[PDB]
C-alpha cells in the first residue's frame, strides 16, 4: 500500500469536524460539549455514566450542565479536550490513532503554550507518528482554489482576517477581532428578554442558538429596516419551544447580527468586521491592494446569515475608492471550508516532508512546533 | 440526503459486517451466532459470553428478567468487567447499548478488538 | 504598432512552430501529442513525459488534480528534476508556466533543447 491516509481534525469553539484526507467531506461533525449530571440518581441498576460527550449530551440537555472546553479559541480545560479527542478517535472514526498522521487547525494569534500542549498531548498520550498544526484561514484559501486574496474567517470563537498574495502571507496585516457567534447568542438572549421570554440555564442557550440559526438575517439598510418593522407586523416569525410553547421573534431577527457591524451594542469600542477587513487591506502595500479587493473570501459558519454578502460588499465599496472592483466570494459550503482545504493540504506530495516526526519531537521537545509550523 | 451522512453510513455498513464476522468467529465455540449486531447486543447476555470466552475468565452470572432494568444491569456488569480490566472506555453507558446507538456499539466493539489482542 | 514587439512577435510566431514540431517527434514514441505549445504545457503532465522520453529515467508520480495548486505541483516536480541534472534556469517558476507566459515557456523549451542535444 504505502502512504496511508492521514486524518484531519478541525476543532473550533462550536463544533469539531473529523475526517480522512482523501474525502471531500468530513466523516464526523459534532458539537464540542461535555455535560455532567446535576441531580442525584435514584434508580439502582440504571448504570453510571460520569460524563456525556457529543451529540447525546445535546440529546440529554435537561439533566446536565453544558460546558465548552474552548473559549475564545483558547483551550481552557484540557481533560475535556482529551475526552473530545478520545471520543473522536475511537467512537466517531473508530481508527487507531498511533498509525495515522494528524492534521490540526488553530487561530492565528493565540497563546504560544497552546500549540505546545497540543503537540505534547498528541505525542505522549495518543502516540501519533506525526502531526501538524495549520492556520484555519490559510486552509480556507486552499478550499477557495486561488493563491491570491484576503480571507475573513468568522467562527464561534474569534474572527480573524489574513491577506495572502501570490502564496506569500503578510504577518503584520493580520487582525483578530473578538466578536463571534457566542457573543451574538448572549446578545440574542438579552434582547429576547425584552418581549417577556427568559432563558437562563445552559441547556436553553442551545435553544436560543437554534433560534438564531433558523430565524436571523442581516438587513441591507438597518435603519430603514427598523422603520419597516415599526410600521407593520409583516416582519414576524413564530418558533416552537421543545415543550410546545410558541414565541414570536418579531423585530429582533435583524438586530442580533447587526451587532457584528456595530460592536457598540455590546459595549465594545472596536470597529466592525467591514472596517476590520478594510484596515487589513490598507495595511498591505500599494501594488497588491487591487488584487486583494477583487478576491475577498468569506469563511466560517458565522458568515451564513442571509444577506451578509451584499451588506459587506456595500460597506467595503463605500469605504474603498470608487474606481475599483469589489466582489465578495461566498461559497455555499463555507462552514466546512476550513476542513476542506485542509484535506487538500494532506493530499499534496511535497507535504510529506514537513510532518513533525516522532524522532524530532523526542530530540527537541514540544517547542519544535514553533520551528516547524508557520 | 446529505454527503456527510452518506459517507458515514457507507463506512458503517462495511465496518459492521467485518465486526459481525469477527465476533461470530470468536463466538463459534459456544452455540450462539448473532445475525444482527445491533439487535442481539441489546439484551447483553451474548456480550458477557463474548468477554468471558475472550478473556478465559469467569464473570458474574446474568440477572434473569425480561424487563428493561435487568437488561441495563446485564450490560452494566460487562461494562464494569471491562472497566476493571484496565481498559479506558469513553462515552460508554448501559442505556446507550440498550437504546441501540450505532456509533457507540461499533466503538465498543472496536475498543474490545483493539484492547483484547 | 510598436515596431519592437512587432519584430519580436514575428520571431516567436516561427519559433513556436519550430519548437512544436521538434517536441512532437519525441512525444510520438508515447501515445501523446500537443496541438498548442502554451496551453497543454500548463497541466504539467506533457512536459513530465517529455522529460521521460528524453532523460530515460523515471520521474515521481504526477498528482491527479484539477486544481491550480496541483498544476503547480506537477510543474514544480519537473523543474526540480531539471535542477537535478545541472541545468541552469533563470527566473523560471511554476506559476510562470501555469499562467502561460510566452517567452518564459519558449526559453524553457530552448534551454531543454540546448542542454539535451
Amino acid at each position: 500500500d504505502d502512504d496511508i491516509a492521514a486524518l484531519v481534525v478541525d476543532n473550533g469553539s462550536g463544533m469539531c469536524k473529523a475526517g480522512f484526507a482523501g474525502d471531500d467531506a468530513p466523516r464526523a461533525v459534532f458539537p464540542s460539549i461535555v455535560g455532567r449530571p446535576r441531580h442525584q440518581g435514584v434508580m439502582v441498576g440504571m448504570g453510571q455514566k460520569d460524563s456525556y460527550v457529543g451529540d447525546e449530551a445535546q440529546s440529554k440537555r435537561g439533566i446536565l450542565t453544558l460546558k465548552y472546553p474552548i473559549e475564545h479559541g483558547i483551550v481552557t480545560n484540557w481533560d475535556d479536550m482529551e475526552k473530545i479527542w478520545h471520543h473522536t478517535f475511537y467512537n466517531e472514526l473508530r481508527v487507531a490513532p498511533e498509525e495515522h498522521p494528524v492534521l490540526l487547525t488553530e487561530a492565528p494569534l493565540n497563546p504560544k503554550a497552546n500549540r505546545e500542549k497540543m503537540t505534547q498531548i498528541m505525542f505522549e498520550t495518543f502516540n501519533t507518528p506525526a502531526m501538524y498544526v495549520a492556520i484555519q484561514a490559510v486552509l480556507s484559501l486552499y478550499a477557495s482554489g486561488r493563491t491570491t486574496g484576503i480571507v475573513m474567517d468568522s467562527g464561534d470563537g474569534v474572527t480573524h482576517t489574513v491577506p495572502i498574495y501570490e502564496g506569500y502571507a503578510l504577518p503584520h496585516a493580520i487582525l483578530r477581532l473578538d466578536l463571534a457567534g457566542r457573543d451574538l447568542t448572549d446578545y440574542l438572549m438579552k434582547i429576547l428578554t425584552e418581549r417577556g421570554y427568559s432563558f437562563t440555564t445552559t441547556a436553553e442557550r442551545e435553544i436560543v442558538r437554534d433560534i438564531k440559526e433558523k430565524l436571523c438575517y442581516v438587513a441591507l439598510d438597518f435603519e430603514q429596516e427598523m422603520a419597516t418593522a415599526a410600521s407593520s407586523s409583516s416582519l414576524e416569525k413564530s418558533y416552537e419551544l421543545p415543550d410546545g410553547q410558541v414565541i414570536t421573534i418579531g423585530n429582533e431577527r435583524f438586530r442580533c447580527p447587526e451587532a457584528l457591524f456595530q460592536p457598540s451594542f455590546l459595549g465594545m469600542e472596536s470597529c466592525g468586521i467591514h472596517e476590520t477587513t478594510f484596515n487589513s487591506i490598507m495595511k498591505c502595500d500599494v501594488d497588491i491592494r487591487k488584487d486583494l479587493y477583487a478576491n475577498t473570501v468569506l469563511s466560517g459558519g458565522t458568515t451564513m446569515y442571509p444577506g451578509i454578502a451584499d451588506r459587506m460588499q456595500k460597506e467595503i465599496t463605500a469605504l474603498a475608492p470608487s474606481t475599483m472592483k469589489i466582489k465578495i466570494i461566498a461559497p455555499p459550503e463555507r462552514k466546512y471550508s476550513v476542513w476542506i482545504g485542509g484535506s487538500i493540504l494532506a493530499s499534496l506530495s511535497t507535504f510529506q516532508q514537513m510532518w513533525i516526526s516522532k524522532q524530532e519531537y523526542d530530540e527537541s521537545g514540544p517547542s519544535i512546533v514553533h520551528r516547524k509550523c508557520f | 440526503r446529505s454527503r456527510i451522512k452518506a459517507l458515514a453510513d457507507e463506512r458503517e455498513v462495511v465496518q459492521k459486517k467485518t465486526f459481525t464476522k469477527w465476533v461470530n468467529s470468536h463466538l463459534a465455540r459456544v452455540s450462539c451466532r448473532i445475525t444482527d449486531l445491533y439487535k442481539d447486543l441489546r439484551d447483553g447476555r451474548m456480550l458477557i459470553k463474548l468477554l468471558e470466552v475472550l478473556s478465559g475468565e469467569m464473570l458474574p452470572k446474568p440477572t434473569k428478567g425480561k424487563m428493561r432494568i435487568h437488561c441495563l444491569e446485564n450490560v452494566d456488569k460487562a461494562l464494569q468487567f471491562l472497566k476493571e480490566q484496565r481498559v479506558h472506555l469513553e462515552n460508554m453507558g448501559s442505556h446507550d447499548i440498550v437504546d441501540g446507538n450505532h456509533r457507540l456499539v461499533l466503538g465498543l466493539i472496536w475498543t474490545i478488538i483493539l484492547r483484547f489482542q | 504598432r510598436s515596431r519592437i514587439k512587432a519584430l519580436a512577435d514575428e520571431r516567436e510566431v516561427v519559433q513556436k512552430k519550430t519548437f512544436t514540431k521538434w517536441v512532437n517527434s519525441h512525444l510520438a514514441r508515447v501515445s501523446c501529442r500537443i496541438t498548442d505549445l502554451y496551453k497543454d504545457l500548463r497541466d504539467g503532465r506533457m512536459l513530465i513525459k517529455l522529460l521521460e522520453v528524453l532523460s530515460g529515467e523515471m520521474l515521481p508520480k504526477p498528482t491527479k488534480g484539477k486544481m491550480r495548486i496541483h498544476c503547480l505541483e506537477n510543474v514544480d516536480k519537473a523543474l526540480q528534476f531539471l535542477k537535478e541534472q545541472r541545468v541552469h534556469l533563470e527566473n523560471m517558476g511554476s506559476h510562470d508556466i501555469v499562467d502561460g507566459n510566452h517567452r518564459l515557456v519558449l526559453g524553457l523549451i530552448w534551454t531543454i533543447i540546448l542542454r539535451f542535444q
Binding site: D1, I4, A5, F20, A21, G22, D23, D24, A25, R94, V95, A96, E99, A143, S144, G145, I329, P331, P332, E333, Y336, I340, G341, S343, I344, S347 | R1, S2, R3, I4, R11, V14, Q15, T18, W22, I113 | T63, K64, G65, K66, M67, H70
Partner: peptide, 30 residues
C-alpha cells in the same frame, strides 16, 4: 486479519476528481 482489512480506509480520493471544490452543494440549503 490486520488493521487495513478491519478498518474500511478509502483507497479512492474524491477531492482529487472534483475540478471546483468551491462549487460544492452538500445540501440544497434553501
Amino acid at each position: 486479519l490486520g488493521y487495513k482489512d478491519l478498518a474500511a480506509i478509502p483507497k479512492d480520493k474524491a477531492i482529487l476528481d472534483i475540478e471546483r471544490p468551491d462549487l460544492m452543494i452538500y445540501e440544497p440549503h434553501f
